[PDB]
Task: inverse folding
């Protein structure tokens, strides 16, 4: 399949070169996989989700995404126009309030919720969780992310937007989950992206167009935007049978475009998520 005039990040993940405009992908498109978006919620009624999104848990008064961030990330995972895995099922877990903030105890609870809830869902191709959030180092947050991964969920987390070493941020610094940095459309490390030995992979994160609340769309930047590219890519590859939740991060690293990014400090992987699609 081919999507012409796609958002640059979708085109980038199906190309060995920057600057293309078509997103090439297998038509299976993540069908049969499930991605939990642990964030501010998802506006599931957005036409771009085509009935494939639903809220499953909220830690606040409402399940509504009153912010937009979670809807944007979910759109990059799996919306029709803006998504990597255009046929995946999306499940929203609202751990962040409508200002985009949340307490670590609540974020931890949301991770434990997914580890258990997935046992109640039909997700024959496997389960992914996208965590576009983080704060300072916390062993408890890292442990919760490790538990979620251990339970059989492919966990992708944002590296953080501090232009600093991700070792000092959580869940970014948890070694057993997939820690995602951000790149721009010219194959530079995004100026805000964290880096360091704990990064596994980079994905498109600067100027990413996706869904927003009120049935709208907008372009925003962050490692929060790179993370759902990788989560969607994992779901897509799991549906194809190329990998499993336990091995998806290493498979994505194995098959990434290598050495194409600039402004990568020595000791940080130079690996950009790539679907290796061949027509």
Result:
């Amino acid at each position: 399949a081919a999507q012409t005039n796609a958002p640059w990040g979708l085109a980038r993940i199906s190309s060995t070169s920057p600057g293309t405009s078509t997103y090439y992908y297998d038509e299976s498109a993540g069908q049969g996989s499930c991605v939990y978006v642990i964030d501010t919620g998802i506006e599931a009624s957005h036409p771009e989700f085509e009935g494939r999104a639903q809220m499953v848990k909220t830690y606040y008064y409402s399940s509504r995404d009153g912010n937009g961030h979670g809807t944007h990330c979910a759109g990059t995972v799996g919306s029709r126009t803006y998504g990597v895995a255009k046929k995946t099922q999306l499940f929203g877990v609202k751990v962040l309030d409508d200002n985009g903030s949340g307490q670590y105890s609540t974020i931890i609870a949301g991770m434990d919720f997914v580890a258990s809830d997935k046992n109640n869902r039909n997700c024959p191709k496997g389960v992914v969780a996208s965590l576009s959030l983080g704060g300072g180092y916390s062993s408890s947050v890292n442990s919760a992310a490790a538990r979620l991964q251990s339970s059989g969920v492919m966990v992708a987390v944002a590296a953080g937007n501090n232009n600093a070493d991700a070792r000092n941020y959580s869940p970014a610094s948890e070694p057993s989950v997939c820690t995602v940095g951000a790149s721009d459309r010219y194959d530079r490390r995004s100026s805000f992206s964290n880096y360091g030995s704990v990064l596994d992979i980079f994905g498109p994160g600067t100027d990413i167009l996706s869904t927003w609340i009120g049935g709208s769309t907008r372009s925003i930047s962050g490692t929060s935007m790179a993370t759902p590219h990788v989560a969607g890519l994992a779901a897509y590859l799991m549906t194809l049978g190329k990998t499993t939740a336990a091995s998806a991060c290493r498979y994505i690293a194995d098959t990434a475009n290598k050495g194409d990014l600039s402004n990568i400090p020595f000791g940080t992987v130079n690996l950009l998520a790539y679907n290796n699609y061949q027509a």
In short: The two ends are 8 Å apart (CA to CA). The chain is about 25% helix and 20% strand. The chain has one domain: 1-279. Residues 1-279 form a domain with the Rossmann fold fold (CATH 3.40.50.200).
